Design a protein around this ligand. Structure first.
Ligand code: 4HV
Ligand code: 4HV
Lengths: 4, 238, 241, 4
């Protein structure tokens, strides 16, 4: 998972 | 006074849906690439087209060109249209999103569509959908007449204010995936805000199962929509 | 199975508490004017909310420290027995704060006490905040139409009398535009309509109002639309218990 | 009318  | 009153959605055109898609950024910003955002853009293009919208996408505009584009849209007539949609897929913080080279305050974008600036949209739904972080907290799991110029806006955020918003590097953002699934299943029948409430429930079921940062495992996210709508909103087939 | 019609479970023994913080006047240095009309608002909410089953508690003109103490107590009592929680603030305000008697308080300070990891007996239950206050210094103008875990932040509903950035209006006898229209819509539809649907009606009623008389001539004709911000995950009703 |  990555984030903005 | 009619409790069931709906917006009139029987114009010749549904309207425009603008998508601003941001994949990468000027190096000085030191922001990472947004792998998975193309999935999000394509998915939205498909769901929104299916609902009658004329979809226009722009990828990695600089702030000046984005503002120019959005200013153009706000000044063309929408007399012929039911409504307007504007989507932003980018990095963000606080109350701003990033264009290629600079941040832009969300307020700067919505202001152009206020009643006194955009007459042909007065009385019509103006819908903004924003996939971006809104701060640096990572949410944790727990176990269970005239009109106001500001009226008729609906702000649909992927996350409540103050928090991280999540993206999968292939499938796209948690929020946009769930929004598009629900639009696919219910978009042309469910009241839009009820639709968004389903989205809130889908997203809030997700959890970070895998991550390069171990302390992110298990963390969470709930979206948030802010409504200044005055009537029920549907996208029945035209 | 995913159920698009799913509702919050509102069959507990008690509907729940509804806290009203009513602010009429303020420490003299703050230089804030008296909020004539606000007792009408408070009394009106008290009756509507009682009719819906809530146990209504009002506090008038608390100082910041005493208000935070009170709200902290409520957030630590068990709500295992309740359907939901309501917290109302009637005061002056700006940006993202409201005023207690002697100081401003950031709204997030108040809501944070009810997050899922701080207030466990409300996890899964609607947490509803209703705020009558200004949110800025723009005066809106008239225009003519041509098992799963849960996030700790989930299940909040924030009901503002006005959109961010704007003035919010109050009549000196009848009370605030917003609370008057919210009360009328609760009166007529509270025990049947889905609550968000009800708030959308409130949006429409308030947006019909205009300033018709005013000490300040340039305010004549001006306007207001409310805003509700939902992190709810299901349908919310207040059927008779 | 007044304001908050
Ligand atoms: C607005 O400014 C920023 C926006 C995004 C990032 C950003 C995103 C990531 C990111 O997605 N990193 C991944 C690996 O690329 C690891 C990670 C870290 C923290 C939480 C999660 C989750 N869930 C994942 C790192 O920085 C950083 C910013 O300022 C420094
Ligand atoms: C949070 O800080 C403040 C809150 C309220 C006032 C405030 C309210 C009024 C007020 O209600 N004035 C009435 C006095 O009767 C006249 C008036 C003025 C402006 C707009 C309208 C309207 N509609 C009405 C004057 O100051 C001033 C604050 O500090 C800048």
């Amino acid at each position: 998972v990555e984030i903005x | 006074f009619d409790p069931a009153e709906k917006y009139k959605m029987d114009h010749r055109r549904r309207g425009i849906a603008l998508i601003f898609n941001h994949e990468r950024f000027f190096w000085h910003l030191t922001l990472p690439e947004r792998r998975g955002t193309c999935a999000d853009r394509d998915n939205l293009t498909r769901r929104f087209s299916d609902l009658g919208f004329e979809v226009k996408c722009f990828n990695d505009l600089k702030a000046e060109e984005l503002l120019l584009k959005i200013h153009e849209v706000s000044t063309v007539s929408h007399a012929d249209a039911d409504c307007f949609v504007c989507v932003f897929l980018s990095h963000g913080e606080g109350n701003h999103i990033y264009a290629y080279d600079a941040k832009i305050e969300i307020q700067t974008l919505t202001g152009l569509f206020k009643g006194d600036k955009c007459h042909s949209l007065v009385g019509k739904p103006k819908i903004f959908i924003i996939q971006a972080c809104r701060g640096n907290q990572h949410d944790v799991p727990v176990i269970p007449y005239t009109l106001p110029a500001g009226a008729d806006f609906l702000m649909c955020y992927s996350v409540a204010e103050g928090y991280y918003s999540h993206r999968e590097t292939v499938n796209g953002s948690w929020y946009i995936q769930d929004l598009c699934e629900m639009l696919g299943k219910y978009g042309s029948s469910l009241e839009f805000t009820e639709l968004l409430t389903l989205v809130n429930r889908k997203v809030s079921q997700r959890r970070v199962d895998f991550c390069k940062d171990p302390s992110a495992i298990g963390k969470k996210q709930v979206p948030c929509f802010a409504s200044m709508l005055t009537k029920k909103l549907h996208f029945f087939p035209k």
